[PDB]
DNA sequence: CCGACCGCGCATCAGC
DNA sequence: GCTGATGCGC
DNA sequence: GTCGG
């Protein structure tokens with residue numbers, strides 16, 4: 398939190414690029430930037446200092462200098478008071494409104510949530526569901542509600558076919574104390590890369606125990622919707638839940654992948670070169686000395702995959718970067 | 719100077 | 735009605 | 745906006 402005033406400044410700037418300017422790369426520059434700065438362990442004293450870091454450059458080093466000397470960014474203040482632009486930026490928080498719809502809406506004077514409630518005839522399904530839950534969807538998820546949720550997802554999934562195999566990945570599988578959503582990955586033997594309605598029946602069971610309350614999108618391998626835990630007391634906030642059906646020969650590659658960590662899984666691609674392997678969500682192999690990657694291996698355990706790329710076991714629970 | 723910067727499932731929209 | 739494109743979430 | 749060829 399040493400340079401929190403700085404990283405907030407860049408995260409603000411990042412959001413406006415994505416949401417108003419629609420400059421996705423500029424958005425990511427500021428993110429990268431606000432990330433490395435959020436790990437620098439000294440109170441940054443100048444833009445020059447900062448520019449020593451990777452992904453801070455000139456325009457940002459001068460935005461820090463102005464920040465450190467005056468406490469503000471004139472472009473930031475001006476944009477915060479700009480009605481059009483602030484309202485665009487805001488609406489995008491509603492799930493299913495990205496930069497495009499938020500722009501369209503603010504053109505026709507729909508600039509607040511209250512306005513979104515006045516005009517359902519204009520929101521697609523996903524966006525209504527987003528509107529309805531806008532508050533809950535910004536809450537985080539205690540680890541203990543996740544285990545309460547995990548115990549439900551595993552119970553029903555098994556109660557529909559004991560030969561299912563399902564894991565809850567994300568920051569929750571890394572031991573963390575809170576989660577944003579819940580990401581479940583699902584497999585069944587009767588379906589490999591060369592291969593029924595395996596995902597639908599799992600969704601239908603969790604609607605039948607009334608665990609899943611809405612659907613944002615559903616297909617034959619991905620489901621994105623809404624769940625909630627039961628209850629005398631106050632009802633729990635409705636949560637985001639995603640279910641992905643993966644093949645068996647690729648499950649543990651995607652489990653590994655979606656478990657992470659983010660900061661970690663990519664460290665194995667600067668290390669998928671000294672052992673020289675192609676590690677993506679599905680497949681894996683060695684590469685050619687001058688080119689093409691081979692024909693993917695077998696996988697059956699998780700860390701069969703760090704065997705193949707010279708590392709020992711690594712349980713998710715005990716490491717980040 | 720000058721292009722790269724992640725790419726994949728699903729819902730929904732142009733454009734036939 | 736079909737298909738390729740674009741928006742969205744992540 | 746920053747990096748790297």
Ligand SMILES: */O=C1\[N]C([N])=NC2=C1N=[C]N2[C]1[C][C]([O])[C]([C]OP([O])(=O)OP([O])(=O)C(F)(F)P([O])([O])=O)O1
Pocket residue numbers: 566567568569575576577578579580655656657659724744
């Ligand atoms: O743009 C992305 N591209 C990509 N190939 N993968 C990806 C992108 N965003 C996220 N992800 C991966 C990694 C991530 O772990 C999962 C699911 O996204 P989620 O659930 O929103 O992130 P997370 O790690 O679980 C979290 F944000 F830390 P949470 O949910 O605990 O707050 O897919």
Ligand code: NA
Pocket residue numbers: 447448449450451452453454
């Ligand atoms: Na730099």
Ligand code: NA
Pocket residue numbers: 488489490491492493494495
């Ligand atoms: Na949104």
